[PDB]
Design a protein around this motif. Structure first.
Motif, short mmCIF file in Angstrom:
data_model
loop_
_atom_site.label_atom_id
_atom_site.label_comp_id
_atom_site.label_asym_id
_atom_site.label_seq_id
_atom_site.Cartn_x
_atom_site.Cartn_y
_atom_site.Cartn_z
N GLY B 2 0.84 -1.22 0.00
CA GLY B 2 0.00 0.00 0.00
C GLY B 2 0.86 1.25 0.00
N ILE B 3 2.18 1.08 -0.11
CA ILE B 3 3.12 2.24 -0.07
C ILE B 3 2.84 3.16 -1.26
CG2 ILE B 3 5.54 2.94 -0.11
CD1 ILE B 3 4.38 1.36 2.44
N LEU B 4 2.73 4.47 -1.02
CA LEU B 4 2.54 5.44 -2.13
C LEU B 4 1.42 4.95 -3.06
CD1 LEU B 4 4.95 6.47 -0.80
CD2 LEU B 4 6.24 6.41 -2.93
N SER B 5 0.21 4.81 -2.53
CA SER B 5 -0.93 4.32 -3.34
C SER B 5 -2.10 5.30 -3.26
CB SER B 5 -1.34 2.93 -2.91
OG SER B 5 -1.69 2.92 -1.53
N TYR B 6 -1.96 6.49 -3.86
CA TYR B 6 -3.07 7.47 -3.88
C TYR B 6 -3.76 7.42 -5.25
CZ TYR B 6 -2.19 9.76 0.63
OH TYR B 6 -2.07 10.04 1.96
N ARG B 7 -4.86 6.67 -5.35
CA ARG B 7 -5.60 6.55 -6.64
C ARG B 7 -4.63 6.05 -7.72
NH1 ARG B 7 -10.93 5.83 -6.12
NH2 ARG B 7 -11.96 7.57 -5.05
N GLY B 8 -3.65 5.23 -7.33
CA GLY B 8 -2.66 4.71 -8.30
C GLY B 8 -1.52 5.68 -8.52
N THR B 13 4.94 11.00 -6.19
CA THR B 13 4.49 11.79 -7.36
C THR B 13 3.70 13.00 -6.85
OG1 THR B 13 2.41 10.63 -7.72
CG2 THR B 13 4.37 9.69 -8.77
N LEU B 14 2.93 12.82 -5.78
CA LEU B 14 2.15 13.95 -5.19
C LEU B 14 3.08 14.81 -4.33
CD1 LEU B 14 0.29 11.28 -5.52
CD2 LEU B 14 -1.41 12.68 -4.36
N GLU B 22 -5.42 19.44 -4.63
CA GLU B 22 -5.39 18.50 -5.78
C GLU B 22 -5.41 17.08 -5.24
OE1 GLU B 22 -1.86 18.60 -8.21
OE2 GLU B 22 -2.79 17.41 -9.80
N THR B 23 -4.58 16.81 -4.22
CA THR B 23 -4.52 15.44 -3.64
C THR B 23 -5.91 15.05 -3.16
OG1 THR B 23 -2.22 15.72 -3.03
CG2 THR B 23 -3.46 14.05 -1.82
N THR B 24 -6.58 15.95 -2.45
CA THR B 24 -7.93 15.65 -1.91
C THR B 24 -8.86 15.35 -3.08
OG1 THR B 24 -7.54 17.01 0.03
CG2 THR B 24 -9.84 16.59 -0.52
N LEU B 25 -8.87 16.23 -4.08
CA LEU B 25 -9.72 16.00 -5.28
C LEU B 25 -9.29 14.68 -5.92
CD1 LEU B 25 -9.98 19.55 -6.88
CD2 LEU B 25 -11.84 18.11 -6.04
N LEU B 26 -7.98 14.46 -6.03
CA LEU B 26 -7.48 13.22 -6.65
C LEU B 26 -8.10 12.04 -5.90
CD1 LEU B 26 -5.78 11.41 -8.33
CD2 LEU B 26 -3.81 11.91 -6.88
N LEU B 27 -8.02 12.07 -4.57
CA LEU B 27 -8.54 10.95 -3.76
C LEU B 27 -10.06 10.88 -3.93
CD1 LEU B 27 -6.40 11.76 -0.61
CD2 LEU B 27 -6.04 9.86 -2.19
N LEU B 28 -10.75 12.02 -3.81
CA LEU B 28 -12.23 12.01 -3.88
C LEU B 28 -12.68 11.56 -5.27
CD1 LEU B 28 -12.80 15.46 -2.13
CD2 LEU B 28 -13.11 13.19 -1.13
N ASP B 29 -12.31 12.31 -6.30
CA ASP B 29 -12.77 12.00 -7.68
C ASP B 29 -12.09 10.72 -8.18
OD1 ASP B 29 -13.89 14.44 -7.16
OD2 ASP B 29 -12.65 15.55 -8.60
N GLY B 30 -10.81 10.54 -7.86
CA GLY B 30 -10.08 9.34 -8.29
C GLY B 30 -9.09 9.65 -9.39
N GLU B 31 -9.24 10.81 -10.04
CA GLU B 31 -8.32 11.20 -11.15
C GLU B 31 -7.89 12.65 -10.96
OE1 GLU B 31 -7.55 8.62 -12.62
OE2 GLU B 31 -9.30 7.35 -12.20
N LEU B 32 -6.63 12.96 -11.27
CA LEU B 32 -6.11 14.34 -11.10
C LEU B 32 -7.12 15.29 -11.73
CD1 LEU B 32 -2.30 13.86 -11.84
CD2 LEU B 32 -3.45 14.15 -9.64
N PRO B 33 -7.53 16.38 -11.04
CA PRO B 33 -8.58 17.25 -11.56
C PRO B 33 -8.11 18.22 -12.65
CG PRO B 33 -7.69 18.15 -9.52
CD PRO B 33 -7.01 16.81 -9.74
N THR B 34 -9.05 18.77 -13.41
CA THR B 34 -8.71 19.78 -14.44
C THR B 34 -8.58 21.14 -13.76
OG1 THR B 34 -10.96 20.40 -14.94
CG2 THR B 34 -10.10 18.49 -16.13
N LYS B 35 -7.92 22.09 -14.42
CA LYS B 35 -7.74 23.44 -13.83
C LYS B 35 -9.10 23.94 -13.33
CE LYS B 35 -7.88 26.86 -16.60
NZ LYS B 35 -9.35 26.95 -16.42
N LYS B 36 -10.12 23.86 -14.18
CA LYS B 36 -11.45 24.39 -13.79
C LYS B 36 -11.92 23.70 -12.51
CE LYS B 36 -14.59 24.67 -17.00
NZ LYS B 36 -15.55 24.22 -18.02
N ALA B 37 -11.94 22.37 -12.50
CA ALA B 37 -12.47 21.65 -11.33
C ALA B 37 -11.68 22.06 -10.08
CB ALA B 37 -12.39 20.16 -11.56
#
Lengths: 324, 311
Positions: B2-8, B13-14, B22-37
């Motif tokens: 499980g080492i360094l496993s944030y949404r893959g 990298t983070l 971004e990390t929170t959005l990455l974890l919540l949404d699952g994919e790095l967010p767009t500038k707008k999001a």
């Protein structure tokens, strides 16, 4: 079907010749309490009914729209600050038991306090000569109730006191696993119970029907994961409702819903099926139905909290989710 | 495993190229967010930073002896009495996400308010422009921190953002199974972590006045934590530009990130009582992340175990 799993005693037998205080002791200690032990327990519980003025102050600060369960969870978490301590083991007093009796004792008074405060009126203080059930009805109605009504409430408390490993107790166990304060673990259990899937007693009060159940069919969630058969508590509540009404539209409608058992071959009436009807028949507002359930489950939660003596278990599960 | 496993995405990298937002959005949404999001989420966070006056008045009536974590739990549960509703799926709004951003945004502000009120001084209100991390140091210290500390704080946040199924996270899931107000679930999570076993960085950061020796004797990753190594590097960097040294000495043995969690916070000026709280400000994202997927496919957790007793 581990029915009547109460410290090796049948719930029906406990339903009589037993009290919430006696039943609470049985669950906490593990054996029927001696007269002296029960007397001391009740007296300590009675002298713990007192509520800090700070709690009532914050309650007034918050809005009336606030749901009782949210207030109960917030208040219990707050109570920990007044009586703090870590059982890491240093130890000032007997954190176990002492904190538990204080909590169980203040649970009912706290619920009543919010009711009056949220209604814009001063709270009704509990009486040191009144039991938990006696105080509940007395504080809610502002007047001491007839013995029968008090006895009915006591039976309800005993029924909702403990039930195998429900989500609320399970959350309490995980919380206790971290060696957290009893107040904190009780706060978590209150929220877990608040959920409709765990405390949808009021969710079953939305009858929205009049003996027309057949049309109202699939294609409130009658059934239980372990109760592949009708919940015994439900049957007890049903007879209690019958006696009270004997001394009603929802009762007829709900009985018709249970009567349509043809539809359900696996699931059957749950405890929440008739719990709300009895509470409403006793005058208790729907908003507090689940809250009363928390008052009873408090005993079981603390009993399991005591059973966490082997807290070597940190309750950390195994990851199986697909970590793409 | 499980080492360094944030949404893959490896936490390293983070470590850079990423912010708690971004990390929170990455974890919540699952994919790095767009500038707008990211911008929208950031603005919404910077919007719910505000705290209801009712909460502070309540905190004032409470005593200074109160432990920050206990107050934090109380506060989160209380907030649930302002933004209300139940997901029958009738909802007055998009409960999920809307409440999620509100909880995450108010987590840090609440912790800081307690620190000042606990000391009988008026709180330091957060700034919309500053980031969660930036606002955090500003609120506690009382002034803008150096980008250095801010960057470090943001990094620490990503490290404690998500940790598989820790007791606190699992507790959030069990409550969620009951479909309960996010506030109630997160408050419970705050309770679990409050346990020294789950979170005791403050307990560890302190030593029994050890005489720089190894007399101590005896009476889940088995190898050093990856986040621990990250803090280890930051620790040397901070001292480069004393107390940590002894920990570097104990690094000879190190295993948990907590090993250095407190020292860094300490240099940033964070009191020991707030160490566990800071962790919560971060694990909040993970708890809410799991809750969303749970409510997507949720089944009440109803386990069973045998117990002797007879009849």
């Amino acid at each position: 079907k581990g029915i009547l799993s109460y410290r090796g005693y049948p719930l029906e037998t406990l339903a009589e010749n037993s009290t919430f205080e006696e039943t609470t002791l049985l669950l906490l200690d593990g054996e029927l309490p001696t007269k002296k032990a029960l007397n001391d327990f009740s007296q300590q519980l009675k002298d713990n009914y007192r509520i800090k003025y700070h709690i009532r102050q914050m309650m007034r600060h918050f809005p009336h729209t606030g749901h009782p369960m949210d207030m109960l969870q917030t208040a219990v978490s707050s109570l920990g600050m007044f009586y703090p301590g870590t059982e890491c083991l240093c130890e000032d007093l007997d954190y176990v038991r002492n904190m538990t009796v204080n909590i169980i004792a203040q649970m009912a008074p706290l619920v009543a306090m919010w009711e009056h405060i949220r209604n814009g009126w001063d709270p009704v203080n509990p009486k040191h000569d009144l039991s938990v059930a006696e105080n509940l009805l007395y504080m809610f109605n502002g007047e001491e109730p007839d013995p029968l009504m008090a006895k009915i409430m006591d039976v309800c408390l005993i029924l909702h006191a403990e039930h195998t490993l429900n989500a609320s107790t399970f959350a309490a166990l995980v919380a206790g696993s971290t060696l957290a304060t009893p107040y904190s673990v009780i706060s978590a259990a209150i929220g877990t119970l608040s959920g409709p899937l765990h405390g949808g007693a009021n969710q079953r009060v939305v009858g929205m029907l009049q003996e027309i159940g057949s049309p109202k069919n699939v294609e409130w969630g009658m059934g239980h994961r372990e109760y592949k058969v009708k919940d015994p508590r439900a049957t007890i509540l049903h007879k209690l409702v019958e006696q009270l009404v004997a001394e009603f539209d929802t009762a007829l409608k709900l009985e018709e819903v249970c009567a349509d058992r043809l539809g359900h071959k696996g699931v059957y009436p749950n405890v929440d099926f008739y719990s709300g009807i009895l509470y409403s028949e006793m005058g208790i507002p729907e908003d507090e139905f689940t809250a009363l359930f928390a008052v009873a489950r408090s005993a079981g939660w603390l009993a399991h909290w005591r059973e966490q003596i082997s807290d070597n278990r940190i309750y950390r599960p195994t990851q199986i989710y697909v970590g793409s």
